[PDB]
Amino acid sequence: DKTVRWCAVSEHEATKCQSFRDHMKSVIPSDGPSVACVKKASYLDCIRAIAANEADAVTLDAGLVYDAYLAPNNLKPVVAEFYGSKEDPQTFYYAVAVVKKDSGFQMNQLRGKKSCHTGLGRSAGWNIPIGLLYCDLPEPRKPLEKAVANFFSGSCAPCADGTDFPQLCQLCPGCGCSTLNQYFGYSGAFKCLKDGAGDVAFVKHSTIFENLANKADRDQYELLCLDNTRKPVDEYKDCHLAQVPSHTVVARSMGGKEDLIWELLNQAQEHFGKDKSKEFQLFSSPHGKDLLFKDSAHGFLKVPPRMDAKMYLGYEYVTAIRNLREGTCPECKPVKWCALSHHERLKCDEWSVNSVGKIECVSAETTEDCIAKIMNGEADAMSLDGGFVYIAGKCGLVPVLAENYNKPEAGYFAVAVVKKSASDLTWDNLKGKKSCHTAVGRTAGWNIPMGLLYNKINHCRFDEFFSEGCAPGSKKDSSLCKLCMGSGLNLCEPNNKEGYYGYTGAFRCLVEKGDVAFVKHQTVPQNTGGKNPDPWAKNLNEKDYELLCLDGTRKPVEEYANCHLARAPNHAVVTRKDKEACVHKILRQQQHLFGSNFCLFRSETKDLLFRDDTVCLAKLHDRNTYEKYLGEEYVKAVGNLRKCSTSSLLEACTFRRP
Ligand SMILES: [Yb+3]
């Protein structure tokens, strides 16, 4: 059986589920998926059941998504309800903090202000902002209503205990827990702000648009961002307290059966979803409202499979709820650095102990795994090629420091290298030629050359432009894995175990099999004239190699400052905004101790943790966003390249922010 065991939490839900089960048998052939209904007492019992392999799937609110991730349940999100419409699906809401234009305070200055909450125990209006403010609340922080009452000067907090904590009901006396109270619910807490009762209103990204039809009125309001700046009310995507998923189907992390759940639901919506008019309706029931799924849903979207709970919920949300659940506060902290290999980890361990606990080391199998650890706070920083920066930025991380090479730089150089003998080659036409790339999605190897190349052919299907090639990171069955030299599983893998990976590897590829290699300006120099002693490079001479220039002409290798494709954003350190300052300070205190003269920018193997050309770590000034650092033309290009290129982390991050 390809049976899916759906978990109900009430008798009404179970009846619907039995009917779901029955009607599915009419539209699904007997090789396809079917439904079993497992009735439980509560969402938590459902969670345990799923984890105990006694059920397979249930649909949850965000807090419960959090519970289900925790050990020993270890469930994850697999399918998402969407709302709104087919065309612009609404999967998340944002919890925001709204304030009056010119009230002149920031998120770190809410102590002593007047607050408006939608209601005690609601998410956007209470659990999130109070969770984020948890550690700014005065001791003792239990009971929590008391500490909140001693934080804001007065408030409207519906359903709070005004008898014991009158400050919480000062702006809505009694704390009316119903619409009889004018300051209740979303519109209510917003009104409390609009009427001048209070200074901040903790609500959803959409409340203000629902209560103020004119842009001119809305310009009177702003949002508090967590970095302690402010933004317009329609920039909530970049200025919110948390991004919250509305309703999420969850399943086991291992043993799923995620594939099957999506097949079941995706066909359920096909035949019984919104506007389908059968007598069985997936998103309603005579037996009651919001059974199994919300009656307001318009369908399901499949959650990208790189996604775990902490990533889906988001850094901010998880911080808020962890604070409420654990209730643990501290009293600038060690920077957790992310290492990708045994050779990187070793350098880091020794860095760790040299700095006296000021640095610590976390490691992961791949760059994307390290990025995901930074995203969710398992780790704090790592240095990255411009192509990963783009990816990290799309995932909400920011660049804090550039690696420097000269003696605030315009960047290293991207060149196209060819063999001198094969003289027919020119930039103006490489169609049908063989190509070597450092890896797909990297600055020099891919984003620049293929960027430019995209503008000339207007599609990113390069395995059909070139004949064959080696471009580590491509789909193994592609023509751009044909020249690669890894064996077995390592073929075309974008790491060391594939010998044509990296700048050097891409040059090796040119030497042995290719017609053009896309590398940086110092790649050929450093792997010729005996400098590289490996058999393949040992006997080579840089005079036998030429660069392709954008005219159509060529030039000797060392004449690169006139024969490059484009300038290249330096590799850069990235982190979370909430650590930009501590990273920015800890590292400048570490490079003025181990920089240029244990050595930080020198390594045992080659280019570990930071590149070895790196003399110093630079300030970025204004250019501390991925788009302000990479620059408009880089991003415009990569945008075009995304159409054909995968990356599973980028698929996950853009599910959350398209
Ligand atoms: Yb690079």
Side-chain angles (χ1 to χ4, degrees), residues 12-247:
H12 293 330
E13 276 206 356
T15 310
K16 182 163 172 176
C17 178
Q18 288 166 331
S19 208
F20 182 28
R21 180 227 298 122
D22 292 343
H23 288 78
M24 281 294 108
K25 290 184 186 316
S26 294
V27 319
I28 285 171
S30 40
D31 70 335
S34 69
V35 182
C37 303
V38 175
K39 194 254 162 159
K40 296 295 193 219
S42 64
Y43 291 112
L44 232 59
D45 281 324
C46 272
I47 280 167
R48 260 106 73 172
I50 288 158
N53 195 39
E54 317 195 0
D56 300 311
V58 74
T59 327
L60 295 174
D61 289 299
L64 289 163
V65 167
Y66 182 74
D67 290 336
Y69 147 75
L70 293 162
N73 320 301
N74 322 106
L75 306 195
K76 58 158 175 187
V78 293
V79 180
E81 290 188 24
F82 72 86
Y83 300 84
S85 63
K86 261 284 146 164
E87 357 298 339
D88 177 358
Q90 298 301 300
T91 291
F92 304 86
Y93 67 94
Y94 297 86
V96 300
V98 191
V99 286
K100 291 278 213 168
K101 175 64 70 74
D102 309 328
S103 41
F105 63 95
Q106 297 292 346
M107 192 76 61
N108 60 0
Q109 297 171 289
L110 289 174
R111 201 168 57 182
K113 316 269 164 304
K114 292 178 307 176
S115 52
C116 313
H117 309 281
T118 58
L120 187 135
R122 297 190 175 195
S123 273
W126 184 265
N127 302 316
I128 287 164
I130 300 309
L132 299 180
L133 299 166
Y134 189 83
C135 290
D136 300 349
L137 303 180
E139 294 166 326
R141 288 176 262 255
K142 225 152 290 172
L144 178 70
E145 300 176 87
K146 182 165 202 159
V148 175
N150 283 31
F151 179 82
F152 301 107
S153 48
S155 333
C156 179
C159 328
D161 181 352
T163 304
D164 295 300
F165 316 111
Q167 304 85 316
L168 299 182
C169 310
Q170 177 196 319
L171 322 183
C172 53
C175 274
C177 198
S178 73
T179 45
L180 288 168
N181 179 354
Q182 57 162 9
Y183 288 161
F184 169 89
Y186 279 99
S187 74
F190 175 75
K191 191 162 180 292
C192 165
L193 171 77
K194 170 152 169 270
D195 296 356
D199 308 302
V200 56
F202 298 111
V203 304
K204 274 167 52 155
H205 77 291
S206 58
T207 317
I208 192 172
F209 300 91
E210 293 157 337
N211 291 278
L212 285 181
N214 295 321
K215 206 193 137 31
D217 290 318
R218 282 189 252 114
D219 289 7
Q220 294 308 109
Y221 299 81
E222 298 184 306
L223 301 171
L224 305 183
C225 324
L226 282 175
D227 70 346
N228 308 313
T229 70
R230 291 188 173 201
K231 286 195 144 79
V233 299
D234 67 329
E235 287 187 40
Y236 48 81
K237 280 177 207 208
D238 315 276
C239 189
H240 60 249
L241 311 188
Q243 162 164 14
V244 187
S246 294
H247 224 209

Side-chain angles (χ1 to χ4, degrees), residues 385-386 412 442-444 503 571 611:
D385 176 70
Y412 69 74
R442 313 285 180 91
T443 304
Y503 306 98
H571 285 210
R611 294 211 329 207

Side-chain angles (χ1 to χ4, degrees), residues 363-409:
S363 43
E365 288 321 283
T366 84
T367 287
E368 317 216 319
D369 294 343
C370 265
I371 292 178
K373 294 195 184 218
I374 284 161
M375 278 167 59
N376 74 24
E378 280 167 25
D380 305 333
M382 82 194 290
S383 196
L384 293 182
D385 176 70
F388 280 131
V389 163
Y390 176 84
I391 284 177
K394 289 294 190 184
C395 295
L397 301 189
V398 287
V400 302
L401 291 166
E403 293 187 333
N404 268 15
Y405 313 130
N406 198 319
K407 292 301 311 187
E409 300 163 23

Side-chain angles (χ1 to χ4, degrees), residues 408-486:
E409 300 163 23
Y412 69 74
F413 280 95
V415 295
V417 182
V418 296
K419 203 169 180 304
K420 190 166 183 188
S421 83
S423 200
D424 49 316
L425 295 171
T426 81
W427 179 248
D428 284 2
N429 216 348
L430 298 163
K431 186 185 169 56
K433 300 288 114 69
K434 302 184 183 200
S435 54
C436 301
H437 301 270
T438 55
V440 181
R442 313 285 180 91
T443 304
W446 192 267
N447 301 328
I448 296 169
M450 297 311 106
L452 293 150
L453 183 55
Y454 181 88
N455 298 325
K456 294 184 158 194
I457 49 155
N458 303 295
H459 66 103
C460 39
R461 280 147 33 246
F462 302 121
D463 46 347
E464 285 164 15
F465 177 76
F466 297 121
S467 49
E468 51 190 350
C470 179
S474 293
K475 9 171 253 155
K476 308 276 174 144
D477 61 300
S478 187
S479 82
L480 305 186
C481 290
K482 260 63 150 100
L483 311 187
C484 305
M485 67 165 268

Side-chain angles (χ1 to χ4, degrees), residues 241-261:
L241 311 188
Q243 162 164 14
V244 187
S246 294
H247 224 209
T248 299
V249 177
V250 293
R252 259 171 268 109
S253 288
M254 280 154 51
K257 308 136 169 168
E258 323 111 36
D259 272 8
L260 216 57
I261 290 155

Side-chain angles (χ1 to χ4, degrees), residues 1 7 10 42 97 99 149 155 165 173 193 212 294 302 348 351 395 499 506 516 535 604 622 652:
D1 60 30
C7 199
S10 73
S42 64
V99 286
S155 333
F165 316 111
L193 171 77
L212 285 181
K294 286 189 197 324
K302 175 157 157 205
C348 186
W351 188 10
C395 295
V516 51
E604 208 191 49
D622 189 48

